[PDB]
Amino acid sequence: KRPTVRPRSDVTHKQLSAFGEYVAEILPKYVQQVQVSCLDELEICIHPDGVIPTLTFLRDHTNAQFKSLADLTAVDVPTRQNRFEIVYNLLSLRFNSRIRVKTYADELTPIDSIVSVHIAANWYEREVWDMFGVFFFNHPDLRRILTDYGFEGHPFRKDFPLTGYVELRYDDEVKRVVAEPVELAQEFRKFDLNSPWEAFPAYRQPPE
């Protein structure tokens, strides 16, 4: 009706809520939270011990058939004890659906790799380790995949600086490409682009 607002269908929300209840009652040992967004996306937040059973159940169950892992990633929220939120987006071609599975980790608690469930998880978990430092148990070959050889630090972390700590240049005395502490001719000018007025009253957190 309204030309500027997205149309909303409630049938997808009902179906995803029913399937979330289904998965939650099937796996109460690991499922910690089930939510359906207003964008009609199902998220299941599980304990890190249940990554392998949850992913295996979602891939091999007759009513799930999430045989395709869309992607695997991490989100660094450095204000909780377990700062890395590991996100698995999965696609079911049989039922034309998508699901999201979340779990948590910190810098010193590795989680189980799901290479035995999906083979794309090999390179995806290599990227997660390279960019966040989240180790993965039982990985066939875990190593860096995008950073330079000998790169120190995991650059997608929040506390890692945007420009990094070292920069490369060709030194003619040693006839090599060498790493120096980073100096910028012009510093990256950060901007404070946050309005002091609340934009969304639906997301107003209660005062502390």
Partner 1 sequence: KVSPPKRAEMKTSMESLIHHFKLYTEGYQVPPGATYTAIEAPKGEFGVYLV
Partner 2 sequence: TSVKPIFSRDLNEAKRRVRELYRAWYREVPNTVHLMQLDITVKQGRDKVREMFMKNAHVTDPRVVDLLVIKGKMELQETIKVWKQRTHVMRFFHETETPRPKDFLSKFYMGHDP
Partner 3 sequence: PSGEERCIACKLCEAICPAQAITIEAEPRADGSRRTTRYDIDMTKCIYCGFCQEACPVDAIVEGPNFEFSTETHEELLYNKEKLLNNGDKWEAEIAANIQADYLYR
Residues contributing to the site for partner 3 (CB under 8 A): 186, 188-189, 191
**Which positions ≥6 away from 99 have C-beta within 8 Å?**
19, 42, 43, 44, 58, 66, 89, 90, 92
Amino acid type, 81: Q
Residue whose structure tokens are 């030194």: 171
Which partner from the list partner 1, partner 2, partner 3, none does 176 bind, CB cut-off 5 to 8 Å by kind? partner 2
Residues binding partner 2: number (CB under 8 A)? 19
Using the rule CB under 8 A, is 73 a contact of partner 1?
A: yes
Residues just before a chain gap in the chain (C–N exceeding 2.5 Å) are none
Q: Cα(91)–Cα(65) distance, rounded to whole angstroms?
A: 8
Provide CB contacts within 8 A for 206, sequence distance 6+: none
| Residue 188 interface partner, choices partner 1, partner 2, partner 3, none, CB cut-off 5-8 Å depending on type | partner 3
Site string for partner 2, 118-137 (x = CB under 8 A): -----------------x--
Q: Which stretch binds partner 1 (CB under 8 A): 20-28, 122-130, 182-190, 198-206?
A: 198-206
Residue 148 near residue 165 (C-beta atoms within 8 A): no
Q: Which residues contact partner 2 by CB under 8 A?
A: 108-110, 135, 142-144, 148-150, 171, 173-174, 176-181
Positions that interact with partner 1 (CB under 8 A): 37-39, 41, 43, 70-71, 73, 75, 87, 89, 91, 98, 100, 193-195, 199-200, 202-203
